[model samples]
Target: QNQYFTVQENYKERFYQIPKVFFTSENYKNLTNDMKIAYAILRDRLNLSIKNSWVDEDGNIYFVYSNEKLMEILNCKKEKLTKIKKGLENDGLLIQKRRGLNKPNILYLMKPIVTERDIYKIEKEENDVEP
Candidate 1:
């Protein structure tokens, strides 16, 4: 796929709102139901806004959020990390290796808009998104 990079001018112009590498789709989907329950607890307890999506960088796109943090925030068991990792790999969202062993990261694989659309579509079907 042709890699697309955000133009410096556009970035400077605030034309896009790319999130940090903390909240990722793989992280969200791979979360255990316990984590989801905890999220619900936090949502009501803290009145937090929870949304998930990917962001584009260069051409490939991956998760914008951190799976590690999300798990931590939800107070998930550390061992569940392996389950999440396995799930992501099985779902085809995760790759064997990103770049280097020293600096491994989930290489972006899809367009941000595409990711957004997929998320919203699912949310809409679940009645979590506004029509």
Candidate 2:
């Protein structure tokens, strides 16, 4: 692999995946755009976490991301990161648990809360948003 991107890539290129529900659901209207992007970034880390079995007994996948490192990846300062974390929590996308003993908190990612109406509205509001 050379710098300046690989000459040939398959579905082999990297991606930041934002859940479709986040964009389509009326429920997520109030969710911050930055929060969605940050969530996508977190999803990008799932391959390694899952491969390493970073999971709880109940089958919940969890991650141990330091505030500093999360800040670096999201390219934000403490205040912004804190706000994004809070926003995700408020919207039920990220639930964190304190592990005690100075360890980083375990972050649990959540799927979107979508309903039938979320899909139905897409057809109704299809013309409202730009790509």
Candidate 3:
């Protein structure tokens, strides 16, 4: 039998288990440093909600975090953060909306639209396009 089929010791060690969708869609590797950090923060917040049993009846969860909090978490200036936010929204990685006066903004994390087949098509299209 191959070692690949054998059970390894300590295989259950703690690691940040990001969804395969992020990697398979290739969005994780495409994101800028600031965007990557911002996404990580969003993931952590969503995880915290699940840990505290804060899911709604339909099992949908959202995280509302302030720009000030994100600034500290990402350790980036407003200009850079703003650029990252716009990029994420444009890339379909998240949907953000203002929640009105005195309320933190609403952030709904999103998965990329690219499926396995679509990923190949996207790469081909990019190669065919002019810079």
Question: What are the RMSD figures for all models against the true structure?
Answer: 14.4, 5.2, 7.6
**Candidate lDDT (C-alpha), each:** 0.44, 0.84, 0.68
Query: Which structure among the candidates has the greatest lDDT?
Result: 2
Query: lDDT per residue, candidate 3, 28-123, as tens digits?
Result: 557675676677667777887777674656787766667777788768888887888888887788887675887767767775565766567656
Q: Which run of 10 residues does model 1 get worst, by summed lDDT?
A: 15-24
Runs in model 3 lying further than 4 Å from the true structure: 1-30, 51-58, 118-131
Cα lDDT for residue 116, model 1? Answer: 69
Cα misplacement distance, residue 26 of candidate 1 (Å): 19
Global local distance difference test of model 2: 0.84
lDDT score, candidate 2, position 97: 97
Ranking by TM-score: 2, 3, 1
lDDT of 1 by residue, 16-109 (tens): 2222211445444554554334433433322122223333344333433356764666466667755645544454434444546565354232
On the 0 to 100 scale, the lDDT of residue 14 in model 3 is 31
Q: How close is candidate 2 to the true structure, as a TM-score?
A: 0.79
Global fold similarity of model 3 (TM-score): 0.59
Error of 1 at 104 (Å): 3.2
